[PDB]
Coordinates of C-alpha atoms and ligand atoms in Angstrom, one line a residue:
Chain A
X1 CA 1.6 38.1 11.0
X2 CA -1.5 38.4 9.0
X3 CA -4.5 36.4 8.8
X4 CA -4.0 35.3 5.7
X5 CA -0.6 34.2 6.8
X6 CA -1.5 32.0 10.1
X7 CA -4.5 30.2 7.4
X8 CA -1.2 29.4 5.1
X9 CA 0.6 28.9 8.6
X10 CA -1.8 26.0 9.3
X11 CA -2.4 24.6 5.4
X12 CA 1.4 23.7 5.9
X13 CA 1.4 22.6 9.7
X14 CA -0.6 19.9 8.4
X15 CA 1.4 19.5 5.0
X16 CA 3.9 16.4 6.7
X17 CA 4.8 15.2 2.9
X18 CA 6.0 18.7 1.7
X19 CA 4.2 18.7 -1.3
X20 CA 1.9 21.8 -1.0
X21 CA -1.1 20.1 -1.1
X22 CA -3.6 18.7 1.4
X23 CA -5.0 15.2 1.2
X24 CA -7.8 13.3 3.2
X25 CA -5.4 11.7 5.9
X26 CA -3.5 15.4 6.4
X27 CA -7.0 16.7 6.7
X28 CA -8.0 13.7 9.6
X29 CA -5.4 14.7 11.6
X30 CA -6.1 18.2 11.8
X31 CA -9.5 17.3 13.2
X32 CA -7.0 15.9 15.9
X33 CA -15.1 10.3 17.4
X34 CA -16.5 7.7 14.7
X35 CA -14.7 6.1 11.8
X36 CA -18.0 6.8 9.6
X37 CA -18.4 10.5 10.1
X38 CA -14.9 11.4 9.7
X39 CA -15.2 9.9 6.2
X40 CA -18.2 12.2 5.8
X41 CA -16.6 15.4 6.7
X42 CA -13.7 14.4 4.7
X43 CA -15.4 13.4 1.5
X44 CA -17.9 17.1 2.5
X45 CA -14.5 18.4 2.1
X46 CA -13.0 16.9 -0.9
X47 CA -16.8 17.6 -2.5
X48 CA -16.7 21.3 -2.0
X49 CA -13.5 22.3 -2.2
X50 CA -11.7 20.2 -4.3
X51 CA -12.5 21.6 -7.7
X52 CA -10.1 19.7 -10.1
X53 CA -11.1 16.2 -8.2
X54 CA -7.7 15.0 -7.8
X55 CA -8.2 14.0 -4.5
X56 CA -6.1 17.1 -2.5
X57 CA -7.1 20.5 -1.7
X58 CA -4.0 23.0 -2.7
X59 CA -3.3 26.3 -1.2
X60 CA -5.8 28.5 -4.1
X61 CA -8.5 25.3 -3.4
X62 CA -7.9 26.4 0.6
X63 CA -7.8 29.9 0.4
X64 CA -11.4 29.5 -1.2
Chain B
X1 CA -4.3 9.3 -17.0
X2 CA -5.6 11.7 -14.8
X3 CA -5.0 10.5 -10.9
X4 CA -7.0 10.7 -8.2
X5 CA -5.8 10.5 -4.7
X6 CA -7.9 8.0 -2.1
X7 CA -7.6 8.5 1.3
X8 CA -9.7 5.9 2.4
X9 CA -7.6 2.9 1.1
X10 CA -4.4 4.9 2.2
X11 CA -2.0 4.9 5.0
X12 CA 0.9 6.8 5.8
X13 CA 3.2 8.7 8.6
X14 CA 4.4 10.2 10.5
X15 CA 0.5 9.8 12.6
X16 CA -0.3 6.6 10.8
X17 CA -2.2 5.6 14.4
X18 CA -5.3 7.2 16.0
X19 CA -4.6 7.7 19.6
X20 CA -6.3 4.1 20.0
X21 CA -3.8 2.7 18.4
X22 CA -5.7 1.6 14.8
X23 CA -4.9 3.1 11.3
X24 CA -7.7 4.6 9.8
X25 CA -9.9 2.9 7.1
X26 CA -8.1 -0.2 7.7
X27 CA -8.3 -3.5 10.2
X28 CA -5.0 -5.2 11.5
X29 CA -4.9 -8.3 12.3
X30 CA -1.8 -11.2 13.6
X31 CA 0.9 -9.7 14.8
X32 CA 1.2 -6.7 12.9
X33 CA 2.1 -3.2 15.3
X34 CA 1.2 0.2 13.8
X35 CA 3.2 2.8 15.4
X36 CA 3.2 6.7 14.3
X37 CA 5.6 6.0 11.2
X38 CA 5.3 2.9 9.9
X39 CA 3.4 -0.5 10.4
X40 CA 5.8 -3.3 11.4
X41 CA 3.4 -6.1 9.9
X42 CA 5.8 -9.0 11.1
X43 CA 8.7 -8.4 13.3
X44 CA 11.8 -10.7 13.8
X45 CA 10.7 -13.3 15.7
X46 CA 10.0 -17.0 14.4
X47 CA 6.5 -18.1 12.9
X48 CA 5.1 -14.6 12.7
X49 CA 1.5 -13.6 10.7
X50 CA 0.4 -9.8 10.3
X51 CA -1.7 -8.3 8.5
X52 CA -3.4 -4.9 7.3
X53 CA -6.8 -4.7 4.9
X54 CA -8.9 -2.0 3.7
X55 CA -12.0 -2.0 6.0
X56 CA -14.3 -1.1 2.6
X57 CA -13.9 -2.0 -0.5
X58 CA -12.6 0.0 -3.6
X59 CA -14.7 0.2 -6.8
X60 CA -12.4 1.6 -9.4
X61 CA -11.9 0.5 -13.0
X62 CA -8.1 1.6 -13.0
X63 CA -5.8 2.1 -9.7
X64 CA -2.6 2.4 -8.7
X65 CA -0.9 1.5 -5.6
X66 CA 2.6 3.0 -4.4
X67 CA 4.3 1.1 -1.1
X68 CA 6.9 1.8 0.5
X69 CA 8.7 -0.7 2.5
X70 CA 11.6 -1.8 4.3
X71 CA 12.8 -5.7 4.5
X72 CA 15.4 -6.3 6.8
X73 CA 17.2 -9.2 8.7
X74 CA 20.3 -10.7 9.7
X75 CA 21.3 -12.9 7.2
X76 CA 22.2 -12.9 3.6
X77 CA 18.9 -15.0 3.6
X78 CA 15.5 -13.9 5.4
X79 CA 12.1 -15.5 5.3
X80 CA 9.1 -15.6 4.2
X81 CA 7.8 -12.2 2.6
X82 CA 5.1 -9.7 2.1
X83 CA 2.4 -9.5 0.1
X84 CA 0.1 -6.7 -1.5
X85 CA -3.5 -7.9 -2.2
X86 CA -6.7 -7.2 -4.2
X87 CA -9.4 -9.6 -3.4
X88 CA -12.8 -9.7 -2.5
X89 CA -12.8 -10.6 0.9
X90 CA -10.2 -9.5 3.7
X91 CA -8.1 -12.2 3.9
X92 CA -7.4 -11.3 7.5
X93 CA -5.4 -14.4 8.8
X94 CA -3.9 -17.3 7.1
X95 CA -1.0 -19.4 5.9
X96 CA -0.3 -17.1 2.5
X97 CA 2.4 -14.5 3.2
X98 CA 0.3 -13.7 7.1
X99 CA -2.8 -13.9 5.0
X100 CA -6.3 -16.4 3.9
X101 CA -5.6 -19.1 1.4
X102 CA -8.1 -19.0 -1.7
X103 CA -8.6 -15.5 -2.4
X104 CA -10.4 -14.4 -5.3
X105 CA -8.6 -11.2 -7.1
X106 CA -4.8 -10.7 -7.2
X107 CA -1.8 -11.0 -4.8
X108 CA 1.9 -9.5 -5.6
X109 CA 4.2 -11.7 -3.4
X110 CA 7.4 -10.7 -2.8
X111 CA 9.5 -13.6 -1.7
X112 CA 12.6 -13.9 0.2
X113 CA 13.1 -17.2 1.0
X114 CA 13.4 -20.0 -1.2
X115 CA 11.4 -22.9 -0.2
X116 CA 12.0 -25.3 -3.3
X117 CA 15.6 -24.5 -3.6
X118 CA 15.9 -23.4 -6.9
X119 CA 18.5 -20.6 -6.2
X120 CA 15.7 -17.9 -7.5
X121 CA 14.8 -16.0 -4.9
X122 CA 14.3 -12.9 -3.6
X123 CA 11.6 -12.9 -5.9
X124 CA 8.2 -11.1 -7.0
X125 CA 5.4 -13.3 -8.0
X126 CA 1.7 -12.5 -9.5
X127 CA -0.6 -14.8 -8.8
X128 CA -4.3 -14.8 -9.6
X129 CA -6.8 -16.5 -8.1
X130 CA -10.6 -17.5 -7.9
X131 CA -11.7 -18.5 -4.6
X132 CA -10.6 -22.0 -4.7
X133 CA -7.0 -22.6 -5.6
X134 CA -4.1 -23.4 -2.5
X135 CA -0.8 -21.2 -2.6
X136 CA 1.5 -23.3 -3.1
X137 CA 3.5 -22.7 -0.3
X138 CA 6.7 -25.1 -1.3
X139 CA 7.4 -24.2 -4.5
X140 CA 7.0 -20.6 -4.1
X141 CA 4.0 -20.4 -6.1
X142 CA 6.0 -21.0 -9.3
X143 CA 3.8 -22.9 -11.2
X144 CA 0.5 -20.5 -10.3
X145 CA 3.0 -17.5 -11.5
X146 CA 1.3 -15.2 -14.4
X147 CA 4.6 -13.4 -14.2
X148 CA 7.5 -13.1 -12.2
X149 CA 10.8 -11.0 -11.4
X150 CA 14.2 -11.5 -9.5
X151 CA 14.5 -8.8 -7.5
X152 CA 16.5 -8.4 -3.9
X153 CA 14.5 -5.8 -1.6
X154 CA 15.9 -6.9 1.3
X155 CA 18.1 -4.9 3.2
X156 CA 18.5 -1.9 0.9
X157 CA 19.7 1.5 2.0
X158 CA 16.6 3.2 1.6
X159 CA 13.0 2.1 1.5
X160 CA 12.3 -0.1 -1.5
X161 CA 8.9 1.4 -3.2
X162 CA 6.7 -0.6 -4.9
X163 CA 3.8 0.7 -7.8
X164 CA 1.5 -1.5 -8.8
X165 CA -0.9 -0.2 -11.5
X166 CA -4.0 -2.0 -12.8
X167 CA -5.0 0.3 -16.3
X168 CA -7.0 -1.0 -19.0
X169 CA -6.9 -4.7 -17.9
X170 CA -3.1 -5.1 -17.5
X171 CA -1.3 -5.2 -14.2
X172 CA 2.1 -3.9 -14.0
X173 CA 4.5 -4.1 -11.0
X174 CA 7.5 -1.5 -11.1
X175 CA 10.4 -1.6 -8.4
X176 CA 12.4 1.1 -7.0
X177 CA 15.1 -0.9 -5.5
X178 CA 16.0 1.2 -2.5
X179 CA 19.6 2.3 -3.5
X180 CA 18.5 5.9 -3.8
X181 CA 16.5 8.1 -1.8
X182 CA 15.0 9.1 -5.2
X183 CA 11.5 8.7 -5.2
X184 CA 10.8 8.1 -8.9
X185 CA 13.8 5.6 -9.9
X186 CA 11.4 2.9 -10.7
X187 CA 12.4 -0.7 -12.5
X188 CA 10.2 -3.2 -14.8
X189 CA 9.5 -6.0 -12.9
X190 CA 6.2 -7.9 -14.2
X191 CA 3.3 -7.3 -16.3
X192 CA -0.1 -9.3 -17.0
X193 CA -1.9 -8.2 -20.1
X194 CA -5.4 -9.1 -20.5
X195 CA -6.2 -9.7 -16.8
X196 CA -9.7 -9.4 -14.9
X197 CA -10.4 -9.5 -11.5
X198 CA -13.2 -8.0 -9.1
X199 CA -15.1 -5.3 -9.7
X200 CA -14.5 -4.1 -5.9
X201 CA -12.2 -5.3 -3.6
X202 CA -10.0 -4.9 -0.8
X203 CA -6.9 -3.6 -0.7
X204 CA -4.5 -5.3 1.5
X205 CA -0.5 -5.7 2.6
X206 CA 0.5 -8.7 4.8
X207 CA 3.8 -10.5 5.9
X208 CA 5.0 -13.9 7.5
X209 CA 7.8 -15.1 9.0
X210 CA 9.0 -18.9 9.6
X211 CA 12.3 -20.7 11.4
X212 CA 14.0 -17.8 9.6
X213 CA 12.9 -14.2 10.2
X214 CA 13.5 -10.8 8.7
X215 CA 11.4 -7.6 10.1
X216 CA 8.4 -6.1 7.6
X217 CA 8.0 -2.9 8.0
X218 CA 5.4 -0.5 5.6
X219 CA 5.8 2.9 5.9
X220 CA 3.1 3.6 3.2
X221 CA 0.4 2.6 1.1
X222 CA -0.9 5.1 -1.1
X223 CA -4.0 4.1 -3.8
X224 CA -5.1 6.2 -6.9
X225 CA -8.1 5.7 -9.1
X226 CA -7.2 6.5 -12.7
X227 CA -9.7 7.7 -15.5
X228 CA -9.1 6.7 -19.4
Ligands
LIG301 CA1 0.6 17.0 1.5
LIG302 CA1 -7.5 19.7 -5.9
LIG303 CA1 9.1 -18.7 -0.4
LIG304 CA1 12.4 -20.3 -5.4
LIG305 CL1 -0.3 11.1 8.8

């Protein structure tokens, strides 16, 4: 395995609806702490990466 | 519409819980038990009051809300309901469906039991309100109604999924009726045109039980913000 393989490896370890997309609750969990700054990593997140704005980071919005 | 997913007034499996046992972004209150999948908001037993709200509230002109829920119990009847709320304070604990009396926004009652007899129920009920008027209880809010539906989601093969969509100033309730595991089978149910309510709010989902009891379970609540 690749890199770039384990990176999709973990995109859809933390995928549980199956729909190839990452939202803000799929992304919580994979940062297994207070209430307030996981909503501002999460919203960091969605801000920087998600560049369509429809509220889930997708595998080309991952990879970068 | 373009649709925007919202974490923050969302919940879902299968790690609904933090290892404290809350749901993120939301307060639980009565006797409602999140576990991993699903949120049992009122279990089984007699005279029962759970609830779940938003712990912030949303400030969107257009939403949409998808649940997905399971009511189940015994008999061929089962009491008293959920609800799914919009309002401007968290109506934590009260005597409406597990929830406070004399909200002010929107709550979308789904009823099993029928408390004035009229041979009409399981049924879905929209009911406004400001701030100062009762639910009444007795009558199954029928005469506070803005719209209504017949609709039995109790003990259905599959979850029974409700979307509730406020766009341009209407509010439409469409039922998936749990015979399918078909996500996207949804029903008309009800519909008010012209409708305003808050400009934020909570989100909320809340259940009751009385002498008769079926178990509430929510498996999810998933909220969009819409744009045009
Ligand atoms: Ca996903
Ligand atoms: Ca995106
Ligand atoms: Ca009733
Ligand atoms: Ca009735
Ligand atoms: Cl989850």
């Amino acid at each position: 395995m690749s890199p770039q393989e384990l990176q999709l490896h973990y995109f859809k370890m933390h995928d549980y609806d199956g729909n190839n997309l990452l939202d803000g609750l799929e992304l919580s969990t994979a940062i297994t702490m207070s209430e307030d700054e996981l909503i501002n990593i999460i919203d960091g997140v969605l801000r920087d990466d998600d560049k369509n704005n429809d509220g889930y980071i997708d595998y080309a919005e991952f990879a970068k | 519409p373009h649709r925007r997913f919202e974490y923050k007034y969302s919940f879902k499996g299968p790690h609904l819980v933090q290892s404290d046992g809350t749901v993120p972004f939301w307060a639980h209150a009565g006797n409602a038990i999140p576990s991993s999948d699903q949120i049992r908001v009122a279990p089984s037993l007699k005279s029962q009051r759970g609830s779940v709200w938003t712990k912030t509230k949303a400030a969107f002109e257009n939403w949409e809300v998808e649940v997905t829920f399971r009511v189940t119990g015994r008999g061929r009847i089962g009491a008293d309901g959920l609800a799914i709320w919009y309002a401007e304070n968290q109506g934590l604990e009260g005597p409406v469906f597990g929830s406070a009396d004399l909200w002010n926004g929107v709550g979308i009652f789904f009823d099993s039991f029928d408390n004035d007899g009229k041979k009409n129920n399981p049924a879905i009920v929209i009911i406004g309100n400001n701030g100062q008027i009762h639910y009444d209880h007795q009558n199954d809010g029928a005469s506070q109604a803005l719209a209504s539906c017949q609709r039995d989601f109790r003990n259905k093969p599959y979850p029974v999924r409700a979307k509730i969509t406020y766009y341009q100033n209407t509010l439409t309730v469409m039922i998936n009726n749990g015979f399918t595991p078909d996500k996207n089978d949804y029903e008309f149910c009800a519909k008010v045109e012209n409708m305003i309510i808050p400009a934020q709010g909570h989100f909320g989902i809340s259940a009751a039980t009385g002498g008769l009891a079926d178990d509430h379970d929510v498996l999810s609540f998933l909220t969009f913000q819409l744009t045009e």
